[PDB]
Design a binder for this molecule. Sequence first.
Ligand SMILES: [Mg+2]
Ligand SMILES: [Mg+2]
Ligand SMILES: [Mg+2]
Ligand SMILES: [Mg+2]
Ligand SMILES: [Mg+2]
Lengths: 382, 382, 382, 382, 382
Amino acid sequence: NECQLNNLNALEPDHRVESEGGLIETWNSQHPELQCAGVTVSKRTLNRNGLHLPSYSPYPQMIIVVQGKGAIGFAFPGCPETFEKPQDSHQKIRHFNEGDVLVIPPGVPYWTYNTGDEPVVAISLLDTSNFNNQLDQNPRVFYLAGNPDIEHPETMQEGGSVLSGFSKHFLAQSFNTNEDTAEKLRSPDDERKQIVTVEGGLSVISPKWGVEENICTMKLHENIARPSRADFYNPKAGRISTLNSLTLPALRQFGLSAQYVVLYRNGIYSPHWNLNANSVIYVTRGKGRVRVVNCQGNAVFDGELRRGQLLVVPQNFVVAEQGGEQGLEYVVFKTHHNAVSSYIKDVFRAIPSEVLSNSYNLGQSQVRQLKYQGNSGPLVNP
Amino acid sequence: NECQLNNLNALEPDHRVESEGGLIETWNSQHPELQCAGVTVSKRTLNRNGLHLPSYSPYPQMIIVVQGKGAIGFAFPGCPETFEKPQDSHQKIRHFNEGDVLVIPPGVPYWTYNTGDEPVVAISLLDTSNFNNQLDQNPRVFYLAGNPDIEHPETMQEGGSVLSGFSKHFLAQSFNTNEDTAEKLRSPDDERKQIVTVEGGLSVISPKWGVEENICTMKLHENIARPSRADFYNPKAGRISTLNSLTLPALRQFGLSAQYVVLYRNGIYSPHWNLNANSVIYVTRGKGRVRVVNCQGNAVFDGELRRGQLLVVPQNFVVAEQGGEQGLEYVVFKTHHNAVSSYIKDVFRAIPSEVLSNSYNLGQSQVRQLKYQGNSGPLVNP
Amino acid sequence: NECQLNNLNALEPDHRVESEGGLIETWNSQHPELQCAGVTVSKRTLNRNGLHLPSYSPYPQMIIVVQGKGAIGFAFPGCPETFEKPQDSHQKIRHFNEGDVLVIPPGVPYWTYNTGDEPVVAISLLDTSNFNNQLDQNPRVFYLAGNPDIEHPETMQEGGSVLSGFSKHFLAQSFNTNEDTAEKLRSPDDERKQIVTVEGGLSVISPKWGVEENICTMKLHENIARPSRADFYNPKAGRISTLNSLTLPALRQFGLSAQYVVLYRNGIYSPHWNLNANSVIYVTRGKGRVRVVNCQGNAVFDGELRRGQLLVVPQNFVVAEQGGEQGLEYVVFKTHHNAVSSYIKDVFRAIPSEVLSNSYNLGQSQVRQLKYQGNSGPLVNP
Amino acid sequence: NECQLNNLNALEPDHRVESEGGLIETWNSQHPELQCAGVTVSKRTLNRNGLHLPSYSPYPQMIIVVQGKGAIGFAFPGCPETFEKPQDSHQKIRHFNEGDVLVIPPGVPYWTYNTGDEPVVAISLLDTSNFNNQLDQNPRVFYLAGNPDIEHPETMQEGGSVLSGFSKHFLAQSFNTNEDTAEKLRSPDDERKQIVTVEGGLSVISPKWGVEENICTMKLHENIARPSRADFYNPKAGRISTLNSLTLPALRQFGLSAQYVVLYRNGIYSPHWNLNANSVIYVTRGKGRVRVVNCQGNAVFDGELRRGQLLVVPQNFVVAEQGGEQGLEYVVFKTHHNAVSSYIKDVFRAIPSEVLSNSYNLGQSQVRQLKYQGNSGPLVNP
Amino acid sequence: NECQLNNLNALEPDHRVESEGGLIETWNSQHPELQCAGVTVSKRTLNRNGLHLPSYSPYPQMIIVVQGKGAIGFAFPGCPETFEKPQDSHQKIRHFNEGDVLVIPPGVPYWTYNTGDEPVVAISLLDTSNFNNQLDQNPRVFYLAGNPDIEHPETMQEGGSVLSGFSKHFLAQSFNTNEDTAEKLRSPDDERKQIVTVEGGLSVISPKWGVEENICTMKLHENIARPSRADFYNPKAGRISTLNSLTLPALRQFGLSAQYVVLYRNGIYSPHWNLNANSVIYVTRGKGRVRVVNCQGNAVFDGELRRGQLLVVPQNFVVAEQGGEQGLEYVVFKTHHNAVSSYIKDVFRAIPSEVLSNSYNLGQSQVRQLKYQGNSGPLVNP
Ligand SMILES: [Mg+2]
Ligand SMILES: [Mg+2]
Ligand SMILES: [Mg+2]
Ligand SMILES: [Mg+2]
Ligand SMILES: [Mg+2]
C-alpha cells in the first residue's frame, strides 16, 4: 500500500535548525510521498566561513550544490594521510562548486567548509531505505563533535556527539591524552550547534587554495549542471544530463543516480517514465507545469512546480514537464545506480504501424506522422 | 509470520475480465499462500486475431504458453528499429508457440497477437515482490492504449490508459501532431477493453510469416516443454527440464527460473525441497497426488492437484508428486534466477552408513539398499 | 606482421580423411589468413548411422550444422547420470539439426551420431589461439577410442587413441576389469578410423527417439539460421541474426560468437567492420560479390565467394557483400564473445553535418541526403 | 628477451607528417624500450580551425591534451542521435582543454576540432599490445575520409581512406545516393591529408559554443592536471594525481591508467616501482634528474629528462625523480587499469625493525630513524 | 611448437647458489618441458636462523613448504602497520610449517625467517608466463637488501640490490637520513648473499613466539598436505586434496591452483587429464610409476618418478600414477585458478552403453561391468 497514492503534493521544508554558521531545513520523512520513495531530503546552508562539523549516517546521501563553493573532507578508515606539510598531515581535501553532486558513503565521517563570500546551499537526498542501512528507515546523523539540535524531529515522537556519551576518564585512557583535553572532546559548553563559524578563516593543506591509488582516493564528486555535460540537447527546447555508475563508479555500491534538466521557455520534456527507479525532483530555478499520471490513467499531480519545491515521481508513473516564461531547471535524484527512463515518441517508433492503428483507431497517414515527424528526442519545442 | 501456513490450498482464478478479443482471469494476490511466495498469477487468453494492447508493469513476469501461437513485440528504450520495409520500421518481432516461456522486463512495454486459428492461452507469474519493483506489492499494469477493465480488483479496496490522463492539447504540442490525432491517443470512446480483435488480420514486418547486437536484441524466450529438452529422464517415470540463468541470461537480473515436469502414469517425483526459492506449481495437464510437509513434520497439503490449479510450495518445505492414471504435467515457477532443489535418495547416498543407521535405527543391510538400489534419480517408477 | 596481409584469398579444404562412417576435410592452418585470425577450420561429415567417436581438444570449437540431424552427448567431469533406464544410465543427450550452432568446451569429451537418412555436414571453427589453450596453436584432437588418422597433418611436421599408450595389464588394474576387456580398450586392429558406422542403429536413452540443474546441464547449442530468429530484416534485401553470450551464456568463457546472414537477389549488406574481433565467413548457400578494404584503402579481396568457400575478414577491415543471381547465405564466426560491428550509413548519422561537409567536400544538401535518406539499417535493397 | 635492456634512452619523435591544418610526430615503434612496453606514441597538433578527420584503430589510445581546447565527437555503433536542431542531428559533442585525458575505444570512429586561437597539442599513447587488438603490434589507423600519409611508416616495411577501396558505383548503391556524391566520398584528389583547416569555422550542435543514459553516453574524458585533483601533496615538494578505473570506468575494459606529477624546485619523488604495469613518462614542462634501476642494481638510466622527452620505465624497475631549477611536470601512462606502485620509505615501515637491522647491518637507532622520521609520503622536500 | 614434445623427462635442479644462511637450487628455464608450461622452479633452503632478505618479482609464485617452520612477512603498499609494541611497528607476521602452500603476489616485497631447529625446505613455482608479468619470460628477482648471486643465470645470457644503483647522497636526501646510513643501504661489501644467518635470533612482534580488515590483511597461505584436508579418499589407495580459488580467493587474480596427492603402496590414481591447465608434479616423498600419453597415443613418459624429481604434464595429456614399495606423495601445481580434471572411469559412466560398445567392440555385459563395477572414484586399490 505505500505507493497507492491518490494525490501527490509539491513539498517544501517542514523543520528548521538555525546554527551559528548556517542553517539546516528538513522535509518530514513521514510525508506519504517520501515514504513511497523510501527517502527524505535535507537543505543545508553554510554561511561565510561556516564549518559543518564531522558526522556520518548509516545510509548514502547524494548532494547537489546549488550555490557557493567549498571543501569537503572524508575520513576513510585506515587509509594513509596523503596530504602532509613539514606540521600537520591529513587526507585528501576535495573542492566543489555549484552544479556539483557529492556522494557520502554509509558510515564514513565528513566535514564541509565554505570557501567563498556567498553562502553555500546544498540539497541532500538521504536514501534511508538503501540496502546498506541495516537499522531502520528513520533518518539518523551521528556527530563526532559539538552539541547538535535534532535535524529530523519526527524520529523522536538538542542532543550530544557520540563522544559525550563516554566519560572524560575513559577518553583520556583511550586516546592517551590528559583529562583536560578529554573533557573538551565531549563538547561540555558548546552552544554553537552543528554548523559553527570559523573566525578568521580555516587553513587546511591544499594545492588549489602509505600510498593508495585505489579505494582510499575514490572519486566521490562530479559536475552535472554545466551546459557542456549535456547528453540530450535541442537548442530550442532544453538539455538533459545523466550522472550514474558509468560516470561515477562508486554509485554502483550506493544505488543512486541523477539527472539535471533544463527546459527553455515553453520547452516540453514529453511523456516519460522511469523503468526501475523512484524519482525525486527538486526545482533549482524557474517554474513550469508538471503532470504525473498513475496506472489508472489519473493525473495525481497537475500544476506548477517552482523553485524550492520537491515532487516525488514514483516508478513507472508517467511524467511530463514544460518550462514557463522563465524556463525550468531541476535535478532528479533516482533510486538506482543506473536508472533508465523511456519516452513515448520513442515507444511509437518501436511499435509496428498496424498495432498502433488498431490501438488508437488511427489511420496509416496519422501513424506515419506520429512515427516520423519531429523532434526525435524527448525535448520538444512546441 | 507470512509463511507460517497451517494449510495450503489448490487455488483457481478469482477474477475475470472478458474483453473483445480475449479473456484475463486473475488469482487474488491476498490469498495467504501467494503472500508467502510474494507473487500473484494471471491467465490470459487471446482469441483468433486477438491483440493484447501495449502495456508494462514495475516487476518481471515469467509467462508459459500452454496453447496456440503468436507474436510478441517489446519496445526497448532508445534501441534502433532493425526491421524496416521500403514504409514502416519497428523493432524485432519474436515468435512463440506452446511450451515456450517468455520473460517481460520491468517497465518495458509489450504487445502480443494471436497468429493461429486456436486461442492462445498463457499463464503469467507476476513477481510483485521482486527487488526491481520499488513501489509496493500490489499488482499494477500501465496501459499505453485503450480503456481497460481492472485486472487485479483487490488492489482498489474500468480505468484509463496513461495517455488519457493528459489533455489533447498538451499531447498535440508534445508529439507534434494535430489535435484530432491527439484526441484518439487518449482513447475517448473505446469499449473494446485491453484485448481487442484485429479484423482481417494484423500485418507486421517479419521473415517467418543503428545496429545493436547486444542489449537491444537480448533473448527473452526459450522452450521448456519439448521432450528433447529434458535434463532428467527415466522412460518408465517421467522427465524434468530446468530453465534458469545458465540458459537464459537475462533471468540473472529478474530473479526467476522454472522447471517443467512430466510424470507418466504412476510415476513418482520422490521427496524433495528447493533450497533457496519459493515455488508455484501450475498444472497444465492431468492430475495426481501431491503431499507438501513443513518443518514440524505436518502435511500442509495432501490431495489431488489437477489441470487449472495453482499450489504454492514454500522454500524448504518437502514436496512429492505422483501422476495419476492420465499422468501429470506441470510448470513450477521458482523465485531465484538459479533455483536448486535436492531430493532425499541423494541425501542418503551422501551421508555415512552409520549416521544413517543411528538416525533411523536401521541395520547395515537396510542402509545399503537405501543407498545403492534404484533408480538413482528423483523420478521413480514404482 | 601476421595481419599485415596485402592480399586475401577465398579458401577451400586442403586435406581429407576418409573414414568408415564419414569424412573430414580440413583447411591448412598455415595459410596466412588463417594465421592472422588464429583459427583453423574443419568440415565433418557423418554418413547415415555414423558415430564420431569420443574426443576432446584443448580449445573451444563452434560448429554450425548445415545439413542433417543428429544427437550429441558430452561427458562433463563429476556430473550425475540423469538419464536412466530400469539397463543403462548416462548424461543428457542433446539433439540438433540444420541451422544449429554447437559449442564444444575445452577438454570435454563429446561424440555425435547421425539420426537421419541423409549425411550430417558440419563445419567447425577450431579456435586454437584461444586463451583457454595453454599448449600451442597446433590443432590437437585426443581420441578416447579407435585409431585415427591425423585430421591436421600440417601441424605435425595415423595415430592411436589415448588409451593405447597404456598396457592392457595396467588398464585392467586401473578400471578393475579383465584382460580381454582391457585389451579391447586399446583398439588394437581397428581400421574404421574416427567415424564409424553403427549397423542396426544406435539406441541410447532419450525422450525424442543427482542434480545439476546448473553447470552439469548448461546450454551448448542454439539455432541461428531460422528466419524467425532474425535480428535485422528488410524484406527486399535480406536478414542478419546474431548469436553471442547474451543468448548462450557459455560463450562468455570461450571467446566466440557468430552471425548468420542471408541476402536476397542483389541485396547489399553495406560497408561495415568489426570493432573487436576477427571473423571467418563460410558460404553455406549461394553466391555473392564480397569486398574487403584494409587501412591503406586497398581492396585486399574483391570478387565472388560461393558456397563451400571460406574468407577471413580481419578486425577493423571494412567488408561489404552483395547477393548474386540466387542470393547469398553465410555464417560468420567471430573471435569475441560479444562481437560488435558498425556500418558506415550509421556513422554518417552520428557525425555533425558540417564535419561530413569538410571531410568529403560535400554541400549541405548532399550531406543532408546521406544522413536522412535510404534505408536506415545495414541491409540495402538496390 | 624484450625487457632485458641494459640501457634505457630518453626518446624524441622520429617521423613527421605535415598536414594542411596540423602536424603529427611519431616515435618509432621499433625502439627496444617501446617494444618492451608494447606501446608506441604519437604527438598530434591541430592548428586553429583544425579538424582531424574521422578515424579508428584496433586498440585503445589514451591522450593527454597539453595545450589548447577543442571538441571531440565519437560515433558509437547503434546509439541514437541525441543532439538535434530543428537542420541536423548527431551524437553527443564532448569538450576538452589542457590537462584533460581522453580515451578512444577500439574501433570507434572519432574526430576532433580546435575551438581556440592557439594550437591544440596532444600526445597519444597507442597501446598496440592491448588484448583488444586481435591484428598485430603494427599501428593501424583506418580513415573514413581524406588521403592520409602513414603516421607510422616503420610498420609498413600516402594511402587512402577505407571508402576509396570501393568503386563510386557500389558506394552510390550502398548508401542510396547519386554518383557525384559517391565519387566525393572516395576523396579523389584531396591533398590536404588527415588534418584539414576549416575556413570560417565549424559549427555543430552544442550548449557551450532515443536514450542512452547508459552505454551510448559513457564518460571518455577526465581532467588530471589541475592542482585541486591532487591525490598526494607536500607543499614543499610537489603533487601526484592518479587517473584509473575507479575514476573513469571505461578504463577497466581498456587496460590503461595514468598519473600526473608535479615536482617543485628540488622536490624528490623518492625511490618507487610499479607492481603490475609498464609505464611511459612524457615530460610536459620543466626538467629533472631521473634514475631507473633494474634487477641487477644497475642504473639503466641516470640523467636529465626535459620537456618533450619520453622515458619507458618497465614493470618493477625502481625509479626516482628530482625537480630541476624550475621544477619538473610529467604524465605517466601505465598499462594496467588500476596500476599500483609502492615507495621504499613505506616498505621500511612495513618490515620489522630487526630484519631491517640484519638486512643492512644497521643499528636499532638508525632503523628507528628511517621508519619514523621524514616525510611519510613519497614526495620529499630536501 | 612448444608443446609438441615427443618425449618428457624427469628433471632435477641444474644450478646452485650457496648463501651464508641457506641454499637455492634452480631448474633451468630453458628445458623444453618447462617452456611448454611457461614456468620455472626454484628450491629454497633456509638453515637455522636463516633470513631470506626482502625481494619481489613481476609474477606470482606458489610455494609448498616441505620441511620446517617459519614466519613470512609481506609489505603491502599503503597498508597500516597493525602490529605494534610500546619500540616498533610493522605489518602482520604470518606463520607457516610443512604442508603449507604460500602465494607471493606480483611486485610485493617479502622476507622469510626460519623459526625451528631444522632447515626449511620449500619449492617454489615461478609462473613467468603469467598475464600479470608485463616484462618477459625471464625470471627476475629484485632484492631490496644484500648482494645476490643470480638464481637463474640462464636468463642472463653476482649482482646488487635495487638500492645500490642509487648514490649514497641521493639516498640520504630521499629518506631524510645521514650518509653513514644511506651508505649501508647500498650493501657495499656484503658477502653473505640473499639468505643470511641471524645470530642470536630474530625477534619481531607476534602473538605466537588503521584497518584493513580487507585487502591489507588478505589470506596468502593454506595447508594442503594434512590428511583431514582430503577431498577424495579410498583407505586402500590414497587421498587427493585440491587448493584453488574457492579456498584461497587471492588465487583468482594469480592464475594458480594445486593438488597434493598421496598414494599408498600400489595405489593407482587411474588415467586422467586436466581440461584447462598445464601442471608440474614435484615428488615430495616416495616413489611411483608415472605414465603420460599425448594426442597420438604415445607414452611420452613411462617410468619411475622419485622424491626431488619434477615432471611436467601438459594440458589434456592423459596421466596415471601408481605408488611404489613405500607409496608416492607429490604436489601438483596447475596454471589455472580453478583447474579441473576428469578421470576416464567417470567418462565411461557418462556415455551411453551402446556408443561404448561400438567404440571398443565390447559386448553389452563388458560395458556393463566397466560402468558399474569398481571403485567409483579416481583412486584404485589393486
Ligand atoms: Mg523527469
Ligand atoms: Mg516440484
Ligand atoms: Mg560480414
Ligand atoms: Mg614515476
Ligand atoms: Mg596427477
